[PDB]
């Protein structure tokens, strides 16, 4: 690993989010900030809000400039509105560089913060393309590149406990690093194989064939790239494009059919408890995603085990059973590779050449028996109609 100062400089966990700490305006005013790959808005909360314990001041800021404009960003999740501005920034745990970025301070939210997550704006790492107002306001990441020699890519490990993290134990744990301009040879095992990032707006890539323990899903892959894939941070779950999530909750049922579960655990709401260190791991399948590979006809596949998809929480009663909720979901937007299937992986995004790598995660969790997995190549033929034209 040649990266030890950013090495570690995450904290967070999948239902919540995993942040970084950065600093705004002169002096510095340090601020929490959720790693997003899935947008790409920097901004922050600029004015008291009952989730927030700390906010950006711009009056206090000597280099605070005024862009004169509003901004209003309406995610899947929830939303804010700003007011646009300039200023400087850094990043403590990050590359010893301070750079002059756009900032959106936000003034009002919906649904926007979590209660007790620790942190208080959002690093969008995703390209310009969707950034709003319009592409024409520069994301953070390219303002870095452009204004210091700090390689255009950056990594994520993105490290999940494996069991419940209560507020204290989650401030005090580490969870991960996000190596800015490198990587971390430290943080992963095995090879790195890349897939190409198909479009640079979201970070999306191409699915071309899906399994549950090895049985083939059997779908048009095009069906799973509706109506796009992206590798996101920002979202908890592994969404799927509705006839993908039916097929696959079928199937995963069928696999684990020695063990019923209600209707609402499959439907991502209630949690489902074992008895302390009992927890049938063994009954649930992997799931194997392939990807299209950098060679032509060529893909390979992440393999993920149930201590992925399967998020620990608190039993209601905070007993002693070990307890989760199902992390994947329905989506009408396309399929989101979301937190608790980055936390199996090193993730590379490098923008460089266009490309995003995958490696089994030093920090993964697992058993005795079975362990994610980063394997290729495999001979995949037309693996460009499993992308998706409106
Ligand atoms: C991470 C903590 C738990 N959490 C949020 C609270 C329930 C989620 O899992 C979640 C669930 C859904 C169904 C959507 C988003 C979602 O919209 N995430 C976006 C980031 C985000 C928004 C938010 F309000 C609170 C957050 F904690 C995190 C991300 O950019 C998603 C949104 C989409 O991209 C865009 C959509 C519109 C504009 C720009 C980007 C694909 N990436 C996030």
Redesign the pocket.
């Given at each position: 690993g040649s990266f030890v100062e950013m090495v570690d400089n995450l904290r967070g966990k999948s239902?919540?989010?995993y942040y970084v700490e950065m600093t705004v305006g002169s002096p510095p005013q340090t601020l929490n900030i959720?790693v997003?790959t899935?947008?790409?808005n920097f901004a922050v909360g600029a004015a008291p809000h009952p989730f927030l314990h700390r906010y950006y001041q711009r009056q206090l800021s000597s280099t605070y400039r005024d862009l004169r404009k509003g901004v209003y960003?309406?995610?899947?999740?929830?939303?804010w509105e700003g007011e646009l501005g300039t200023d400087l920034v850094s990043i403590p745990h990050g590359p010893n560089v301070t750079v002059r970025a756009n900032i959106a301070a936000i003034t009002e939210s919906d649904?926007?913060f979590?209660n007790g997550s620790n942190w208080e704006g959002?690093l969008?790492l995703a390209y310009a393309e969707?950034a709003?107002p319009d592409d024409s306001l520069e994301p953070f990441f390219d303002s870095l590149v452009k204004q210091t020699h700090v390689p255009n890519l950056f990594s994520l490990q993105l490290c999940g406990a494996g069991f419940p993290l209560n507020q204290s134990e989650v401030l005090a744990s580490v969870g991960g690093s996000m190596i800015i301009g490198g990587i971390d040879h430290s943080l992963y095992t095995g090879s790195l194989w890349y897939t190409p990032i198909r479009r640079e707006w979201?970070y999306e890539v191409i699915i071309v064939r899906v399994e549950i323990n090895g049985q083939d899903l059997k779908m048009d892959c095009k069906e799973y790239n509706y109506d796009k894939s992206?590798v996101?941070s920002?979202?908890?779950?592994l969404?799927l494009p509705k006839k993908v999530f039916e097929a696959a909750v079928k199937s995963i049922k069928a696999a684990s059919s020695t063990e019923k579960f209600p209707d609402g655990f499959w439907l991502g709401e209630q949690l489902v408890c074992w008895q302390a260190g009992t927890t049938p791991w063994n009954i649930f399948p992997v799931i194997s995603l392939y990807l299209m590979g950098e060679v032509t006809n060529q893909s390979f596949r992440i393999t993920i085990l149930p201590q992925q998809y399967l998020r620990p929480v608190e039993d209601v009663a905070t007993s002693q059973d070990d307890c989760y909720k199902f992390a994947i979901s329905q989506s009408s937007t396309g399929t989101?590779m979301?937190?608790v299937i980055m936390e199996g992986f090193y993730v590379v995004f490098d923008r460089a050449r266009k490309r995003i790598g995958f490696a089994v995660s030093a920090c993964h969790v697992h058993d005795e028996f079975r362990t994610a997995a980063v394997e290729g190549p495999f001979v995949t033929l037309d693996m460009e109609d499993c992308g998706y034209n409106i």
């Open positions: 239902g919540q989010g959720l997003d899935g947008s790409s960003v309406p995610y899947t999740q929830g939303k649904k926007f979590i959002i969008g969707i709003r979201y992206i996101d920002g979202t908890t779950n969404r989101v979301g937190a």
